[PDB]
Design a protein around this ligand. Sequence first.
Ligand code: SF4
Length: 54
Amino acid sequence: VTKKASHKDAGYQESPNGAKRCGTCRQFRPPSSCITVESPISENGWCRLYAGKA
Ligand code: SF4
């Protein structure tokens, strides 16, 4: 079964970046998954590969 990108390979941190977090993001998948990144991921652990969407 195919794997996501690691939170590491996605450029993540342990806190939000200003306006941007996980939580809902443009890409978050509650309670602990992501559409960019592997699970378990933090509900505030923002990644650099998150979607450029408005
Ligand atoms: S794409 Fe990145 S910032 Fe967005 S929810 Fe997933 S890990 Fe977080």
